[PDB]
Design an enzyme around this catalytic site. Structure first.
Site, PDB file in Angstrom:
ATOM      1  N   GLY A 191      58.227  27.435  -7.228  1.00  0.00           N
ATOM      2  CA  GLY A 191      58.547  27.714  -8.637  1.00  0.00           C
ATOM      3  C   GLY A 191      57.782  26.863  -9.635  1.00  0.00           C
ATOM      4  O   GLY A 191      56.771  26.261  -9.308  1.00  0.00           O
ATOM      5  N   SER A 192      58.286  26.816 -10.861  1.00  0.00           N
ATOM      6  CA  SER A 192      57.642  26.077 -11.938  1.00  0.00           C
ATOM      7  C   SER A 192      58.683  25.691 -12.983  1.00  0.00           C
ATOM      8  O   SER A 192      58.352  25.421 -14.131  1.00  0.00           O
ATOM      9  CB  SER A 192      56.519  26.934 -12.548  1.00  0.00           C
ATOM     10  OG  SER A 192      55.527  27.257 -11.563  1.00  0.00           O
ATOM     11  N   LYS A 237      54.206  18.421  -6.302  1.00  0.00           N
ATOM     12  CA  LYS A 237      54.138  18.930  -7.653  1.00  0.00           C
ATOM     13  C   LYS A 237      52.714  18.696  -8.227  1.00  0.00           C
ATOM     14  O   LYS A 237      52.267  17.576  -8.284  1.00  0.00           O
ATOM     15  CB  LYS A 237      55.146  18.194  -8.543  1.00  0.00           C
ATOM     16  CG  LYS A 237      55.185  18.809  -9.930  1.00  0.00           C
ATOM     17  CD  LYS A 237      56.301  18.275 -10.811  1.00  0.00           C
ATOM     18  CE  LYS A 237      56.053  18.658 -12.266  1.00  0.00           C
ATOM     19  NZ  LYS A 237      56.907  17.842 -13.168  1.00  0.00           N
ATOM     20  N   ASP A 270      64.358  14.955 -12.739  1.00  0.00           N
ATOM     21  CA  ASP A 270      64.034  15.386 -14.119  1.00  0.00           C
ATOM     22  C   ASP A 270      62.790  16.244 -14.115  1.00  0.00           C
ATOM     23  O   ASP A 270      62.168  16.417 -13.065  1.00  0.00           O
ATOM     24  CB  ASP A 270      63.851  14.152 -14.978  1.00  0.00           C
ATOM     25  CG  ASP A 270      64.142  14.381 -16.450  1.00  0.00           C
ATOM     26  OD1 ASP A 270      64.184  15.537 -16.955  1.00  0.00           O
ATOM     27  OD2 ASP A 270      64.339  13.355 -17.132  1.00  0.00           O
TER      28      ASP A 270
END
Ligand SMILES: *CCC(=O)Nc1cccc(-c2nc(NCCc3ccccc3)c3ccc(N)cc3n2)c1
EC number: 2.7.11.24
Length: 328
Positions: free
Chosen positions: A27-28, A46, A156
């Site tokens: 995902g993003s 990431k 986060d």
């Protein structure tokens, strides 16, 4: 210097060390699942999106890397690795972060006992984060990751639904307990299965909040030196404090009590993470010898106004100096 390999994923070229295998998107920036051969672990890799695109992207990049390098705690996401395919500063333009891959988030995922354990874990991480003089500010079910063992990590669904009312109002001097408010909101949602305050916008949001906690009293109003904000609450519908037992009907009363102590409008009175840990509701998990605090964290960079290339070069320093955690 490891040996990298290139691979195109979802319209983007990933260049990663061979240690990381079977990249698979999740995902993003955007994230891949990978197998890490040096450890045996499934990890998330990431790739930052345009890390040095503006002063603000660059400083943000720097900030995220500094934070991740600092966090060493069971209930906070920390850094397994950080790397760039760049051979020098001059050609430094990509940043990859490697963390533990967590099964799911709270947004996915209850019994009172299940709730005890997850909220206890969030509070234990928050103790640690707060001890470094860091405020998370964006706690919400999607920022809390859980594995199949029920182990929770902070990392986060509208942000606004979990935001302390002092942030909604743009108070410049809000404290760590904004995160406690969020936890309160999360916990309520776990115990009831409903978003406690699903505002459609920031006015609706405060309207919903005030229906439960009550219009603010004199003791709080006198701490507000903006007639603008002052004139709001005065003017906004003038309701009394609801009884939490009457709102969270049939929930564990200790859970309702902790909820009372978290969802206090006056942040000066709101319980702290460390306090909430010693609350009775966590009787079966609380251990004050197993609730560590963090090393101090140098936040002076936050007040610095620097050039893109300087934020970039600080970031490169942090990549280069990274010491991976031991195997265990
Ligand atoms: C001096 C400028 C100023 O007073 N700014 C300002 C603007 C808005 C809020 C505060 C403020 N807020 C809170 N929290 C109450 C939030 C709230 C939300 C909805 C309805 C009613 C109230 C504060 C809490 C505790 C202290 N000590 C100060 C606060 N200031 C300030």
């Amino acid at each position: 210097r490891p040996t990298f390999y290139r691979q195109e994923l979802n319209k983007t070229i990933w260049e990663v060390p061979e240690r990381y295998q079977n990249l698979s998107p999740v995902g993003s920036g955007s994230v891949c699942a990978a197998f890490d051969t040096k450890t045996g672990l499934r990890v998330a890799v990431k790739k930052l999106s345009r890390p040095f695109q503006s002063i603000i992207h660059a400083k943000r990049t720097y900030r995220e890397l500094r934070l991740l390098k600092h966090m060493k705690h069971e209930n906070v996401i920390g850094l397994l690795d950080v790397f760039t395919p760049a051979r020098s500063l001059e050609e430094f333009n990509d940043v990859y972060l490697v963390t533990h891959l967590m099964g799911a988030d709270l947004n996915n995922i209850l019994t009172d006992d299940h709730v005890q354990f997850l909220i206890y874990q969030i509070l234990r991480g928050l103790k640690y984060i707060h001890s470094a003089d860091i405020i998370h500010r964006d706690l919400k079910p999607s920022n809390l990751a859980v594995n199949e063992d029920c182990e929770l990590k902070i990392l986060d669904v509208a942000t606004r639904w979990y935001r302390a009312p002092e942030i909604m109002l743009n108070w410049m001097h809000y404290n760590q307990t904004v995160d406690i408010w969020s936890v309160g909101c999360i916990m309520a949602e776990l115990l009831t299965g409903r978003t406690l305050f699903p505002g459609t916008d920031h006015i609706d949001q405060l309207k919903l909040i005030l229906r439960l906690v009550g219009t603010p009293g004199a003791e709080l109003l006198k701490k507000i030196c903006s007639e603008s904000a002052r004139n709001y609450i005065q003017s906004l519908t003038q309701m009394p404090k609801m009884n939490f037992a009457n709102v969270f009907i049939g929930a564990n009363p200790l859970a309702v009590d902790l909820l009372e102590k978290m969802l206090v409008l006056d942040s000066d009175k709101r319980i702290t993470a460390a306090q909430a840990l010693a609350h009775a509701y966590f009787a079966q998990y609380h251990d004050p010898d197993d609730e560590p605090v963090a090393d101090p964290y140098d936040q002076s960079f936050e007040s610095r106004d620097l050039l893109i290339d300087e934020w970039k070069s600080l970031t490169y320093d942090e990549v280069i100096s990274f010491v991976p955690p031991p195997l265990d």
